[PDB]
Every structure is written in C-alpha cells, then in structure tokens.
C-alpha cells in the first residue's frame, strides 16, 4: 500500500507569518497521460467537519481564499499559507487519491506562544474520598507552555509509575496556553503506610526541576 | 448545497450489530459513490471503504475484512452501514464521505459510537481544598473530583455560572469501563474562606444534579 509520512508534527506560530507543510510520498502519483498529480489537501475543524482546499496538489478550490496555495508534483507535495489569521487553528491533513486502498498523513497541527510556567497547584486528599474505601492525589499542572512535558511521581522517595492518570487539555483562547492534570489513585491502607507525597514535574524554560511536596501526619 | 443528514450518538453493548445511517438530499443518488473514513484516536483517519449504489461494485479495507459490509437504499436515498462483532478498539467517529469529483469531497457529522459493558451510575464528587495554612501566591486555587458517571457528558459550572472565568476542563479518561475527570478554577484570597464556593455538576442521563459546597 502506498504510505504517506508528514514533517513536522507540530510548529508554534504567530499571527501573520508563512507556513509551511510538507506531505511525502513513498511512490510516484503522477499519472503521465494528464500530469495530474492524485492527491489534496484536508482540513478539519475542532468540531466542525473536514474540509477540502487545494485539489490536485497546485489548485484553489471555490470558497477557499487566496492565502492557500500549494505546489510540488510526483514526490514532494508542499502547502503554503501566505498570511494566517485567527481562524485558522485547524488541522491538515493530505490523502492520495491514485492506488486503492487510500491512506491518509500523520496530521499537521498549528500552534500560539509563548513563555507560560506554573508552581504549586498540588492538593490533599480530602475526607469524602477515605470513607469509601480508596484515596487519590491530583497534581494539576495550569499556566504551561509547551505541552511537551514530563510529570514524575515519588513517593516516599520511591518512583512510582503504576496508577497515574494524565490528561491533556487544548490551547487556550484568551492567553493561548495550555492545562495538564495528572491523578494518581490507590487503595486506603497504602495510604496509610506513607507519609511524603512528592508532585515532580520538569520544564524546557528552567535549568531546575520543580520540587514540593507535601505530609501526611 | 448538498446535505449529508446521519445518525446520532448510540451505546450499544459489545457483542451485538450497530447500524450508521447517512441521508443524502439535493443531488441523484445513482451518479456520485459514497465512502467511509473512520477517525480515531483524535486525529488519525482510517478509511474503511467505498460503494457504487448502481452497479453494486463494492470494495473494503485489509483492517476492516469480515466487519463492515456497506449496503446501498434505491427508494429512500439513503446509505447504510452495518458492523458485526464489536470489539474495544472500534470505539470511534465514522463519517460518510460524498466523491462528487476529483475536485472536492462532501463530508457529515459524524457518529459518535462508544461501546463499554457499562451501567448507568450517578457521579459520586469529591470535594478538595489546599491542606497548607499558608501560601506564598495571592491566588487560591481550588477544585473538585467527578468520579464513576456513565455516560459522556458531564456539564460542570461553578457558582451557577457567575465564576465563569479561569475555568479550566479536563477530558475525561476510561478506567475500569466508567470514566473520571476534573475542574481548576483561580480565586483570589480575599474570599476564600470567608466566602464560600460550590461545585455544580449535571448528567442528564441520570437526572441527578448534587451541590458540593467547599
């Protein structure tokens, strides 16, 4: 089957500047009676359907604006914005249309800066949780950027990696950051025999790790 | 222009068939084909196959052999699609996709389709607060765990929408067929504790609505 790859995963932008998309082919798409090259250009909405915009990889389609355009032919396949707006935080996508069965890419996705850092948002187990037979210690991790981030929990300066539940949030609209919780849950008695319960979480914008914990008695 | 009208959003139990509807209006159903892309894991797109209501020509995908089998409707104007043997990895969005030409492709709204063997429980919350007496920030944040509800979603608001700023919503995550999530907000010193906050959480499909006051 004909497997398409997409460089780079993910690039951080500001409003007003080029971007560039690259979509590679591991074969030929250009079929010589034509010189029509099989393949177009996606685009999907958080919510909304996906969309189409540059068909034959050199194209505008009606209903799409000036500012996309695309090039290349057979192998190397590039989509470029001259000005980006607002609006368009979406995801790319390019799908060849020349050998069934169709592959899709990776997915492109856009992004804002920058300069977002967080301290302490490290909470106890309240009571309500004990009396129904567990425990569970949350460490929220507001006000961040990038998302590429690593969270370490210790425990009694033991690594524990078993129980630890992450979840990512998306860019925000007012302030363009990010938000990360990560719940460590566990039984009643093991949180008895323990004491210190240490958050670890370590950064790109700091040369130190951001250490604090918090007792038990 | 042209309307692709499909189903809604079904919980069906492993082991039995579900069945995606797509409607089409505005255009001959026995000229263009319809096609099916499946969306997993957020982003990734799969296709699943194709088929010509004409001449009943009918192709599917090495993933999809022996589990999605697409059957056209001449009287109604309309697609089907039918899956047997459900398993875990087919929880997805499913969207009917219109070939017109090669120029552009019409596309729907998708079908939510999750599959648990899974019961309807009302959301047992938690409240939490900051164990310090102290801290060093002029911002107190606060915060409150929903655990065990079934099924997707949960509206979570705080101070019956008057705290509506620096409010932060965390997707849930599936542990143990029954799904968890949480909530942060930032509230100055000067209120808290003198003032006092609540959690206000909803499930519509259990009718249940508890006030947590922190």
């Known amino acids: 089957d004909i497997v398409m790859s997409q460089s780079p995963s993910s690039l951080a932008v500001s409003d007003g500047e080029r971007v560039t998309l690259t979509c590679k082919s591991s074969?030929?798409?250009?079929?010589?009676?034509?010189?029509?090259?099989?393949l177009a250009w996606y685009q999907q909405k958080p919510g909304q359907s996906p969309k189409l915009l540059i068909y034959?990889?050199?194209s505008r389609e009606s209903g799409v604006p000036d500012r996309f355009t695309g090039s290349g032919s057979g192998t190397d396949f590039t989509l470029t914005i001259s000005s980006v707006k607002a609006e368009d935080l979406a995801v790319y996508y390019c799908?060849?249309?020349?050998?069934?069965?169709?592959?899709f890419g990776a997915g492109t996705k856009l992004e804002l800066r920058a300069d977002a850092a967080p301290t302490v948002s490290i909470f106890p187990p309240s009571s309500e949780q004990l009396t129904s037979g567990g425990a569970s210690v949350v460490c929220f991790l507001n006000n961040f950027y990038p998302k590429d981030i690593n969270v370490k929990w210790k425990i009694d300066g033991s690594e524990r990696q078993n129980g630890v539940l992450n979840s990512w949030t998306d860019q925000d609209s007012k302030d363009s950051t990010y938000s990360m919780s990560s719940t460590l849950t566990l039984t009643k008695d093991e949180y008895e025999r323990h004491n210190s319960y240490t958050c670890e979480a370590t950064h790109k914008t700091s040369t130190s790790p951001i250490v604090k914990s918090f007792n038990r008695n | 222009e042209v309307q692709l009208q499909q189903s809604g959003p079904e919980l069906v139990k492993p082991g039995a068939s579900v069945k995606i509807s797509c409607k089409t209006s505005?255009?001959?159903?026995?000229?263009?084909?319809m096609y099916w892309v499946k969306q997993s894991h957020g982003q990734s797109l799969e296709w699943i196959g194709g088929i010509n209501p004409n001449i009943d020509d009918t192709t599917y995908n090495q993933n999809f052999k022996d589990k999605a089998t697409l059957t056209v409707d001449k009287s109604s104007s309309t697609a089907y699609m039918e899956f047997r043997s459900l398993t875990f990895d087919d929880s997805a969005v499913y969207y009917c996709a219109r070939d017109d030409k090669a120029s552009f492709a019409f596309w729907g709204q998708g079908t939510l389709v999750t599959v648990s063997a899974a019961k309807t429980t009302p959301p047992s919350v938690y409240p939490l607060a900051p164990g310090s007496a102290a801290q060093t920030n002029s911002m107190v944040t606060l915060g409150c765990l929903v655990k065990g509800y079934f099924p997707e979603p949960v509206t979570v608001t705080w101070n019956s929408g008057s705290l509506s700023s620096g409010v932060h919503t965390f997707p849930a995550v599936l542990q143990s067929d029954l799904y968890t999530l949480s909530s942060s907000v930032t509230v100055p010193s000067s209120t808290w504790p003198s003032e006092t906050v609540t959690c206000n959480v909803a499930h519509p499909a259990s009718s249940t609505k508890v006030d947590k006051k922190i």
């Open positions: 799908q060849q249309y020349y050998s069934y069965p169709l592959t």
């Open positions: 034959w990889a050199s």
């Open positions: 505005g255009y001959t159903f026995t000229e263009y084909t």
């Open positions: 074969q030929s798409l250009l079929y010589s009676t034509n010189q029509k090259n099989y």
